[PDB]
């Protein structure tokens, strides 16, 4: 009964509205929330709207629908690949930099198109929809999915039925990620989504401006989990009709491309009011067409795109660093860092492809390890300005001594972080070799393996720099 569901959702909104659980209680907060959510989901009837046909049965409808509104529909076909899922395959040879794909705005689903929808009145009367475009986009999806004569029906009928975002993982699958950096953003994702479902279920059932929405008596946890994972795995940012501010939008036909390594080749053209994509490389006929999604970490690919990309040259882990206010040299270091446009304490990144540290982190480590004399040579004199300009440059060291002390610092810091994981690198390679795992399980384990392999790379890199610059002191 919907009276039992309204009781259960109030009980869920409460559990998700408390503060952070604490230090070593975040795994059990997530299991408690999981228990309540799974109870609700198993009393509901999955997706509220399902389609008679199979997914590929609606792609001609999508092509026909995109052709009539000006999109490119020639040169490619839809193929269900095992590895990436559905995607685009070239039916002809396509050269690098050729403009093969274009989608006018009239087809997109935007935040503003959600404001002009049957969702409109509720949107204008709800703080959270007004503040969160991605949620507003998500409810746009559900309201058009529930609309039998919707203009976007060819798009919605070709969207997946489920995803590999963590919102779909099992307990044992998320459990592999314990002690990682990644799992804290998986906890946030589950808590946030669960809170938003419990809040909006009450709104849809009782708000006077949601009364004649089609979602009224058909809004399951599954419905919302699918909507946000749809938005999360393929939403974009485009300019407005005029070009002043940016907005969030879903791009039909083009969002069907799968990711590979490379550069971004999809831009918006304000003049002709359309999204444009040039071929990132040469695609022979019969080869899959990929695009570069963006510079994103494996943590972000798994959590928000629902997959793990193996060849990811933009992989990174986070690292907290700052000058301790108990340093005798806090004031000078804080002024040098300020003059370099660098915060006193910040969250930096260790990287997978050399060099492990950006120009900003190297400049910080250099100031962090400077002596009083060196600090003065960057604060006073005619060369002080020119000396700060080169802090982030590997070819202009402050001293051999400074470099040795900062690579010694980095080597110890990554070594320390490595030990805070519950499994080792060798243990992870063993689990991948000797076990047989689901796709979602492989994601979790490859993710925690990746975090550690970056730390280990940083250790070795910092050690060889340490030894190179220590040989320079001896001469």
């Amino acid at each position: 009964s919907p009276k039992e569901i309204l009781n259960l959702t109030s009980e869920l909104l409460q559990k998700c509205s408390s503060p952070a659980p604490g230090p070593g209680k975040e795994w059990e907060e997530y299991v408690q929330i999981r228990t309540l959510v799974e109870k609700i989901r198993k009393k509901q009837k999955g997706l509220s709207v399902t389609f008679d046909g199979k997914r590929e049965d609606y792609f001609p409808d999508l092509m026909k629908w995109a052709s009539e509104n000006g999109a490119s529909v020639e040169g490619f076909e839809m193929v269900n690949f095992k590895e990436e899922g559905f995607g685009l395959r070239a039916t002809r040879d396509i050269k690098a930099e050729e403009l093969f794909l274009w989608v006018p705005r009239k087809l997109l689903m935007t935040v503003e198109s959600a404001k002009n929808s049957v969702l409109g009145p509720l949107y204008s009367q709800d703080r959270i929809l007004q503040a969160m475009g991605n949620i507003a986009l998500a409810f746009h999806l559900l309201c058009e999915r529930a609309s039998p004569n919707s203009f976007w029906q060819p798009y919605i009928q070709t969207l997946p039925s489920e995803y590999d975002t963590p919102l779909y993982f099992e307990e044992d699958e998320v459990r592999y990620l314990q002690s990682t950096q990644a799992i804290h953003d998986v906890f946030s994702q589950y808590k946030n989504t669960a809170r938003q479902y419990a809040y909006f279920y009450k709104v849809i059932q009782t708000h006077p401006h949601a009364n004649k929405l089609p979602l009224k008596d058909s809004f399951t946890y599954e419905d919302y989990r699918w909507a946000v994972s749809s938005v999360m795995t393929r939403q974009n940012q485009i300019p407005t009709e005029d070009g002043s501010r940016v907005t969030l939008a879903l791009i039909p036909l083009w969002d069907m491309c799968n990711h590979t390594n490379g550069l971004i080749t999809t831009g918006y053209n304000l003049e002709d009011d359309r999204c444009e994509c040039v071929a990132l490389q040469d695609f022979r006929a019969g080869e899959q067409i990929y695009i570069f999604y963006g510079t994103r970490s494996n943590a972000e690919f798994v959590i928000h795109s629902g997959f793990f990309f193996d060849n990811n040259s933009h992989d990174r882990v986070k690292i907290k660093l700052g000058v301790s206010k108990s340093d005798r040299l806090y004031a000078m270091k804080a002024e040098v860092l300020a003059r370099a446009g660098i915060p006193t304490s910040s969250v930096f990144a260790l990287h997978f492809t050399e060099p492990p540290i950006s120009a900003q982190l190297l400049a910080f480590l250099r100031v962090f390890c400077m002596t009083e004399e060196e600090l003065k040579e960057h604060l006073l004199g005619d060369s002080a300005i020119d000396r700060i300009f080169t802090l982030g440059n590997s070819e202009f060291p402050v001293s051999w001594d400074n470099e040795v002390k900062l690579w010694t610092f980095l080597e110890d810091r990554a070594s320390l972080l490595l030990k805070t994981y519950k499994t080792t690198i060798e243990e992870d390679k063993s689990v991948l070799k000797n076990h047989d795992l689901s796709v979602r399980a492989k994601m979790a384990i490859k993710l925690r393996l990746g975090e550690k392999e970056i730390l280990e790379k940083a250790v070795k890199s910092a050690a060889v720099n340490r030894e190179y610059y220590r040989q320079q002191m001896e001469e």
Partner: peptide, 16 residues
Amino acid sequence: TLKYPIEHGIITNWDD
């Protein structure tokens, strides 16, 4: 490069 790069699956904040 491009005037308006379109990043597919751009990361947004979901914390309401």
